[PDB]
Design a protein around this motif. Structure first.
Motif, PDB file in Angstrom:
ATOM      1  N   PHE A   1       5.675   7.720   1.027  1.00 13.89           N
ATOM      2  CA  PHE A   1       5.875   6.512   1.809  1.00 13.89           C
ATOM      3  C   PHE A   1       4.769   5.496   1.591  1.00 13.89           C
ATOM      4  O   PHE A   1       3.652   5.827   1.170  1.00 13.89           O
ATOM      5  CB  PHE A   1       5.961   6.836   3.294  1.00 13.89           C
TER       6      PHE A   1
ATOM      7  N   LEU B   1       3.904   0.880   2.541  1.00  6.74           N
ATOM      8  CA  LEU B   1       4.134  -0.213   3.448  1.00  6.74           C
ATOM      9  C   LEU B   1       3.869  -1.515   2.713  1.00  6.74           C
ATOM     10  O   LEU B   1       2.834  -1.685   2.060  1.00  6.74           O
ATOM     11  CB  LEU B   1       3.217  -0.062   4.667  1.00  6.74           C
TER      12      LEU B   1
ATOM     13  N   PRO C   1       8.170  -0.843   6.163  1.00  2.97           N
ATOM     14  CA  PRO C   1       7.956   0.550   5.776  1.00  2.97           C
ATOM     15  C   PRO C   1       8.989   0.966   4.739  1.00  2.97           C
ATOM     16  O   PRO C   1      10.161   0.589   4.829  1.00  2.97           O
ATOM     17  CB  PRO C   1       8.191   1.320   7.079  1.00  2.97           C
TER      18      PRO C   1
ATOM     19  N   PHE D   1       0.834   4.798   0.719  1.00  2.00           N
ATOM     20  CA  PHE D   1      -0.044   5.782   1.334  1.00  2.00           C
ATOM     21  C   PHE D   1       0.098   7.085   0.584  1.00  2.00           C
ATOM     22  O   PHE D   1      -0.894   7.684   0.174  1.00  2.00           O
ATOM     23  CB  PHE D   1       0.302   6.026   2.800  1.00  2.00           C
TER      24      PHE D   1
ATOM     25  N   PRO E   1       4.415   0.991  13.995  1.00  2.00           N
ATOM     26  CA  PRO E   1       5.542   0.345  14.664  1.00  2.00           C
ATOM     27  C   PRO E   1       5.701   0.911  16.069  1.00  2.00           C
ATOM     28  O   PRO E   1       5.528   2.118  16.279  1.00  2.00           O
ATOM     29  CB  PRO E   1       6.742   0.754  13.803  1.00  2.00           C
TER      30      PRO E   1
ATOM     31  N   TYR F   1       0.850  -1.177   0.000  1.00  4.43           N
ATOM     32  CA  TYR F   1       0.000   0.000   0.000  1.00  4.43           C
ATOM     33  C   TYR F   1       0.890   1.233   0.000  1.00  4.43           C
ATOM     34  O   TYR F   1       1.705   1.425   0.898  1.00  4.43           O
ATOM     35  CB  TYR F   1      -0.973   0.022   1.197  1.00  4.43           C
TER      36      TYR F   1
ATOM     37  N   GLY G   1       7.331  -4.254  18.182  1.00  9.30           N
ATOM     38  CA  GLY G   1       6.116  -4.878  17.715  1.00  9.30           C
ATOM     39  C   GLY G   1       5.359  -3.923  16.819  1.00  9.30           C
ATOM     40  O   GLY G   1       5.756  -2.772  16.617  1.00  9.30           O
ATOM     41  N   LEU G   2       4.258  -4.410  16.271  1.00  6.40           N
ATOM     42  CA  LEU G   2       3.572  -3.700  15.219  1.00  6.40           C
ATOM     43  C   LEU G   2       2.080  -3.843  15.412  1.00  6.40           C
ATOM     44  O   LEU G   2       1.556  -4.943  15.558  1.00  6.40           O
ATOM     45  CB  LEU G   2       3.991  -4.274  13.876  1.00  6.40           C
TER      46      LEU G   2
ATOM     47  N   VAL H   1       0.376  11.097   9.778  1.00  6.43           N
ATOM     48  CA  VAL H   1       1.397  10.459  10.582  1.00  6.43           C
ATOM     49  C   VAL H   1       1.389  11.019  11.988  1.00  6.43           C
ATOM     50  O   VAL H   1       1.505  12.214  12.200  1.00  6.43           O
ATOM     51  CB  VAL H   1       2.781  10.661   9.978  1.00  6.43           C
TER      52      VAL H   1
ATOM     53  N   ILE I   1      -1.457   1.802  11.013  1.00 11.26           N
ATOM     54  CA  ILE I   1      -0.316   0.893  11.119  1.00 11.26           C
ATOM     55  C   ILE I   1       0.794   1.548  11.958  1.00 11.26           C
ATOM     56  O   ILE I   1       1.392   2.542  11.557  1.00 11.26           O
ATOM     57  CB  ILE I   1       0.211   0.464   9.720  1.00 11.26           C
TER      58      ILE I   1
ATOM     59  N   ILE J   1       7.154  -7.355   7.054  1.00 13.80           N
ATOM     60  CA  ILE J   1       6.492  -6.059   7.098  1.00 13.80           C
ATOM     61  C   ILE J   1       7.552  -4.963   6.896  1.00 13.80           C
ATOM     62  O   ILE J   1       8.440  -4.773   7.713  1.00 13.80           O
ATOM     63  CB  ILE J   1       5.685  -5.872   8.418  1.00 13.80           C
TER      64      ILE J   1
ATOM     65  N   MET K   1      10.784  -6.077   8.711  1.00 18.12           N
ATOM     66  CA  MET K   1      10.604  -6.855   9.923  1.00 18.12           C
ATOM     67  C   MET K   1      10.136  -8.250   9.551  1.00 18.12           C
ATOM     68  O   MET K   1       9.047  -8.454   9.002  1.00 18.12           O
ATOM     69  CB  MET K   1       9.616  -6.196  10.879  1.00 18.12           C
TER      70      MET K   1
ATOM     71  N   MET L   1       0.723   5.346  11.163  1.00 19.04           N
ATOM     72  CA  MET L   1       0.413   5.703   9.788  1.00 19.04           C
ATOM     73  C   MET L   1      -1.064   5.488   9.549  1.00 19.04           C
ATOM     74  O   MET L   1      -1.576   4.363   9.596  1.00 19.04           O
ATOM     75  CB  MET L   1       1.232   4.892   8.782  1.00 19.04           C
TER      76      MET L   1
ATOM     77  N   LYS M   1      -4.565   6.174   7.313  1.00 18.39           N
ATOM     78  CA  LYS M   1      -5.168   6.425   6.021  1.00 18.39           C
ATOM     79  C   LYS M   1      -6.660   6.521   6.276  1.00 18.39           C
ATOM     80  O   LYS M   1      -7.218   5.647   6.949  1.00 18.39           O
ATOM     81  CB  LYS M   1      -4.872   5.277   5.064  1.00 18.39           C
TER      82      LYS M   1
END
Ligand code: C8E
Ligand code: C8E
Ligand code: C8E
Ligand code: CL
Ligand code: CL
Ligand code: CL
Ligand code: CL
Ligand code: CL
Ligand code: CL
Ligand code: CL
Ligand code: CL
Ligand code: CL
Ligand code: CL
Lengths: 231, 234
Positions: free
Chosen positions: A68, A70, A94, A60, B97, A58, B71-72, B127, B95, A92, A112, B115, B117
């Motif tokens: 940016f 992801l 960024p 953004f 981090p 995606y 973690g995420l 952001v 999303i 994952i 990650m 992040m 949207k």
């Protein structure tokens, strides 16, 4: 009337000092920000393995001053030997690009990784740096690169500074690059290589990459084709 | 035999100078690294135009250990808006981090990046980030200074919020006390300030209460809220 990008392509790669042959088939589609990639890769002597890989991205934001997006993805390493042990990898990432000056740009990707059963194993892989832009055709890129495995058992660090000089002149892409692997657990090591590419203007393109590396000589050579049709 | 964390809780919050009442119900479960959070929130004018937030959230903790942890999170939220002068909806995908990193025995570099949207009615990328240093004095006391930024992106458009935040988490016996200030630096460059105290209590049985008072100004602002949370495991 809705705009899709359909790319399909394949790559053959071999690394020698005998060696490893690496057939690669991939294709992906894109709508606005969204994109989907499937790929299949295989590694074997000319004990082997194959990579099924699914990937979504995606984006953004895309605009000059800041951009940016992801990526997620899943990969499976089927190992076959000389019994079928499998290992899964969830990714994952960024990925960003940021505008500092008309020339200067701060960008890179962070990844990650989490690995599934057989073979915890978290992993971080990152390449981030500065892109100086001379003109339309020429740009320099210096990045910091790090790969880290985490926490008998355990893993270690890889550190490198990388430099590419992307050159776009007419239909040709030429991208000399060096990787200076830093200590990274130990002694220096080095990759140098040239990335040639060509575009026939019709959606077809070819990619020829040669690389040497040493610590321990290493020869990498690979080719590829990609076809881009839109809609 | 497999270890789950089930938390459920609710919060009431009101912000005045009249004001906004904010009922909040939430619950979440956790297995090893994985965690799931559902929450429902609502914003409206009291007496002594509104909206509601359905929110789903997942969190994968890749790594937890002293020297490094991260973690995420991902999550979906829906703002149902209902009004006075028709139910227009807006969705938000998040999303984040989140990390903590060990510099020294005292010093710690951590924070979260988010992040956003936004979906239809009302593009709008956003952001939001809070990242900084945590000095640790002892078991009970720790200081935290963070940089905080919220940015809307690219008539139409949005702007920047910049703040330095400081908290002093204090854990003494069953009580949590966390004085904090937010010094808002930028919007367009006017100065603004939040100060507040975060009290909390634990009954040691899984029940806990949270009382937070805050004042803010630029334009006086009074925030006050309470909450309860029950933790049962397995
Ligand atoms: C994976 C194989 C890809 C090869 C694509 C062939 C298409 C070349 O012709 C395109 C039209 O000219
Ligand atoms: C989602 C609802 C969350 C709870 C709502 C809070 C408002 C009033 O609830 C008070 C709950 O107090 C009961 C606490 O649970 C019993 C104490 O457990 C201790 C026994 O070991
Ligand atoms: C918002 C949802 C959060 C949690 C809801 C799902 C609840 C499912 O939990 C079930 C717990 O475990 C399932 C069975 O437990 C294991 C039984 O077998 C173990 C003994 O060998
Ligand atoms: Cl790069
Ligand atoms: Cl030029
Ligand atoms: Cl070079
Ligand atoms: Cl390359
Ligand atoms: Cl909340
Ligand atoms: Cl929020
Ligand atoms: Cl924080
Ligand atoms: Cl304070
Ligand atoms: Cl609170
Ligand atoms: Cl608050």
């Amino acid at each position: 009337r809705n705009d899709w990008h359909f790319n399909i392509g394949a790559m053959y790669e071999i690394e020698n000092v005998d060696g490893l042959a690496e057939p690669s088939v991939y294709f992906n589609a894109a709508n606005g920000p969204w994109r989907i990639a499937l790929a299949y890769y295989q590694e074997g002597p000319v004990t082997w393995f194959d990579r099924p890989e699914l990937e979504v991205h995606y984006q953004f934001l895309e605009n000059d001053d800041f951009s940016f997006g992801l990526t997620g993805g899943f990969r499976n390493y089927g190992y076959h030997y000389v019994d079928t042990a499998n290992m899964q990898r969830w990714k994952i990432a960024p990925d960003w690009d940021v505008k500092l000056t008309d020339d200067l740009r701060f960008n890179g990707w962070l990844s990650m990784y989490k690995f599934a059963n057989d073979l915890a194993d978290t992993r971080v892989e990152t390449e981030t740096g500065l892109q100086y832009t001379f003109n339309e055709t020429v740009a320099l890129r210096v990045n910091y690169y790090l790969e880290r495995g985490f926490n008998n058992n355990g893993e270690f660090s890889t550190q490198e500074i990388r430099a590419y000089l992307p050159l776009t002149l007419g239909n040709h892409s030429v991208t000399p690059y060096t990787r200076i692997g830093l200590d990274r657990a130990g002694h220096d090591f080095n990759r140098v290589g040239l990335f040639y590419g060509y575009d026939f203007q019709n959606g077809l393109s070819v990619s020829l990459e040669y690389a040497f590396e040493w610590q321990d000589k290493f020869h990498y050579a690979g080719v590829g084709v990609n076809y881009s049709f839109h809609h």
